[PDB]
Design a protein around this ligand. Sequence first.
Ligand SMILES: [Mg+2]
Ligand SMILES: [Mg+2]
Ligand SMILES: [Mg+2]
Ligand SMILES: [Mg+2]
Ligand SMILES: [Mg+2]
Ligand SMILES: [Mg+2]
Ligand SMILES: [Mg+2]
Ligand SMILES: [Mg+2]
Ligand SMILES: [Mg+2]
Ligand SMILES: [Mg+2]
Ligand SMILES: [Mg+2]
Ligand SMILES: [Mg+2]
Ligand SMILES: [Mg+2]
Ligand SMILES: [Mg+2]
Ligand SMILES: [Mg+2]
Ligand SMILES: [Mg+2]
Ligand SMILES: [Mg+2]
Ligand SMILES: [Mg+2]
Ligand SMILES: [Mg+2]
Ligand SMILES: [Mg+2]
Ligand SMILES: [Zn+2]
Ligand SMILES: [Zn+2]
Lengths: 78, 50, 203, 66, 136
Amino acid sequence: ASSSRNGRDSNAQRLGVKRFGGQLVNAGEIIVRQRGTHFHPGDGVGRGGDDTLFALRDGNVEFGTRRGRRVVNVTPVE
Amino acid sequence: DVRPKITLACTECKERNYITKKNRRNNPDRMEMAKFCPRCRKHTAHRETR
Amino acid sequence: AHEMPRLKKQYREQIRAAMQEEFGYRNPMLIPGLEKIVVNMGVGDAAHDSKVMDGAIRDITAITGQKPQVTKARKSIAQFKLREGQPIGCHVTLRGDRMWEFADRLLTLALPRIRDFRGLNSNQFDGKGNYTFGLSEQVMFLEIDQDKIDRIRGMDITFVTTAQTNEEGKALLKHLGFPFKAKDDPKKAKTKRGPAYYAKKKK
Amino acid sequence: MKQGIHPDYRETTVVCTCGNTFTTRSTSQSGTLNADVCSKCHPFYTGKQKILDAGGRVARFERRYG
Amino acid sequence: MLIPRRVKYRKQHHPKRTGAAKGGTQLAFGDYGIQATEGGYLTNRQIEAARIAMTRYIKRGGKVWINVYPDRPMTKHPAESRMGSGKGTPEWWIANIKPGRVLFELSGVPEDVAREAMRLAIHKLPMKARFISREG
RNA sequence: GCGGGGUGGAGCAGCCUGGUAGCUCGUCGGGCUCAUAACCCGAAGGUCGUCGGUUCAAAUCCGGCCCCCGCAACCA
RNA sequence: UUUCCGGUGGCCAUAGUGGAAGGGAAACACCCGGUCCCAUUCCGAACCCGGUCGUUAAGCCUUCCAACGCUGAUGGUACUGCACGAGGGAUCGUGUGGGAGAGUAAGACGCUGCCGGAAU
RNA sequence: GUCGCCUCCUAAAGGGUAACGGAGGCGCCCAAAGGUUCCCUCAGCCUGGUUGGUAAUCAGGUGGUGAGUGUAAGUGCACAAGGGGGCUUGACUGUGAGACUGACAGGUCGAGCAGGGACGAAAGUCGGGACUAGUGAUCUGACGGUGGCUUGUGGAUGCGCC
Ligand SMILES: [Mg+2]
Ligand SMILES: [Mg+2]
Ligand SMILES: [Mg+2]
Ligand SMILES: [Mg+2]
Ligand SMILES: [Mg+2]
Ligand SMILES: [Mg+2]
Ligand SMILES: [Mg+2]
Ligand SMILES: [Mg+2]
Ligand SMILES: [Mg+2]
Ligand SMILES: [Mg+2]
Ligand SMILES: [Mg+2]
Ligand SMILES: [Mg+2]
Ligand SMILES: [Mg+2]
Ligand SMILES: [Mg+2]
Ligand SMILES: [Mg+2]
Ligand SMILES: [Mg+2]
Ligand SMILES: [Mg+2]
Ligand SMILES: [Mg+2]
Ligand SMILES: [Mg+2]
Ligand SMILES: [Mg+2]
Ligand SMILES: [Zn+2]
Ligand SMILES: [Zn+2]
């Protein structure tokens, strides 16, 4: 008959933004899982080995632009 | 077989502290590294075991 | 030693005055002058051995007076049979006093003793006041020996001048003194070989 | 310049065996060089030549017959 | 028969056949033309039949433009076989036609014989189409 | 469908892998003979079915295609 | 206080690209040297050092030019959540909310903060 | 024919989503292709030039990403994560606030701290590699270290821990 040379696929990795704008986060809380820097680390946000953006401090998450880059900041809580 | 697992032991307290991989063809001889020896409690020269 | 070269002195006085008078530059620092001299040689038959590169290094070192930059192959090519990173050419950049005295030596001594020398074409400018030409043979530089050269090699000589336009570059290099300006012979062979190869059909 | 990588490039006069002598700090370890011919002593532009050609095909005819 | 020299992917999903014509709803090259009033798939065989009809009727004069191109491949399941075992091999090449799309254009021909040639062509197409002009 | 094969004029090597295409016969030129066959001495001869890709580089690696084979195409 | 200019940010083309004209008081710059720290996978070109003569030619600065590019409504259309409807069928329509892309008028030869400079 | 892992599409603008659906990869590699610090900008095109040709090396002009990235693809990267030089071993030991993601086993990220280092004038960065595949639970056995235990005691032997 016939057969397919396809049928392989990788497991779902579950990327994407995990905390949206204004959401209160704790220090170290993961903000976005991603491959490559679609979002760059902004103020109060660190970037991990697999390009995960996480919170360096408590506060509220905001998405903005720092110079020419899309960045994610954590504004310290009032 | 071409990139075997080599074990680095400290040349002071002969303790197999670390394990890593070399190329055997790109690095035929035993490798020398300065790693942290927990027993010697400092950075000591580490050599691949024979 | 400390002495401003003959060619540099001639350039400054005579050539700067002549250019200021017969181009009418409205600013004093617009008179063109030699910026640098580049001595290249592609020794591409070095993909099979290293002795040819050593000989080329010795020859260019003796000719110029400084160690050459040896360029490694940017990309490998099978039909030229060169791998990646092999040394296939060497070049020297001369500026200032070394530039001036090498140019003086070359013009006064070397190309005069080219076999059946007929001068240099005036139509070998890049189009921006810089003039590059080629020597097919090397030992004609009498600053080197004669009976120990490994093999005959050639080279490319490039004069880069701060000249905006081709006509003023030609004027500068004439005033410095270069065999050329004749007529056909130069431009003649030029047009010829030009048209000839200039076609292309890699497809 | 970097020390120890460049050749000897001391002074060097030049006798062109033709009434022309200059001084350039070339690489001639010995010193002055000896020119078989200068540029001002050479037949190229000092005008000492003028070959052009010999295109008188008819001129040959009356040379050997006229 | 119009067949593309190559395509990026030979096995593709069926083209969307919803909506009106995305673009090319107006005459761009010729004086008269065929405008499809209904959507559908237009195979290269149908395109060739219509083009042959128009050219043959207009004889030597005038010029014809084929605005659409059958660059979408359609696979066919192997005959007499149960469902499965992967997608088939491309068998047809179609163009995605939507209402209002100008399919063919004609120029350099008087209006009456142009109309007759367009009628001959339209009777070969699988969807309804009409003769259009630049208002004369 | 599975697997193999396509290289001078013919029949066959070169395919783990890239870089140097070989043997036998035949073709062609010269000897030997009265002449032919045989034999002796020299030479040419295939850019590798085709399209495309990989790669610095393809007979060799990969895919499509064409041709030739073999096998399978079953249970009621 | 103002004007002009040099640095250093912010917005990241409404700022760019290209063309034209003009300017240097401080300043910037090219420029002039290489002795000295230092430097070139060769080269005092660059980096670095020493000068500020020369020069506004260029960088830089000012004015001008919608020319390429950029920005860009309103209205309409596509699509669409919900609720229905019509065709033999591809598919299509309406109600009620949302509503582009393109295109059109147009905008635009940048805006703004701090520090320093020379003058007022 | 397929069975685990990775990338894309299908997948309907979070995540997830099946088929013997559509495309490809993986079972490595690198002592630098890791760390750090400083420096650099490509491909293409045009012109001129010994050998030299479309294309080697050289010069000028142009050119912002179309080159490049050890390896698929995507997301990234010209601020370079791309190219080069110097010095190095953090391809660390003891840790992990706080999160991500799975029915679970599990998979992933991680600030801060101490020890002891590398680099940098410093600020600082470094718990392998631009990112995501390059992998196998438990059992049983093995080697190295440690010396917790050892059936009367001391050894031995065996075991435990790492
Ligand atoms: Mg990392
Ligand atoms: Mg990692
Ligand atoms: Mg359009
Ligand atoms: Mg039976
Ligand atoms: Mg608009
Ligand atoms: Mg709009
Ligand atoms: Mg999704
Ligand atoms: Mg959805
Ligand atoms: Mg399901
Ligand atoms: Mg790098
Ligand atoms: Mg390791
Ligand atoms: Mg925790
Ligand atoms: Mg994973
Ligand atoms: Mg520390
Ligand atoms: Mg230090
Ligand atoms: Mg890497
Ligand atoms: Mg790196
Ligand atoms: Mg068991
Ligand atoms: Mg007892
Ligand atoms: Mg431990
Ligand atoms: Zn030790
Ligand atoms: Zn002479």
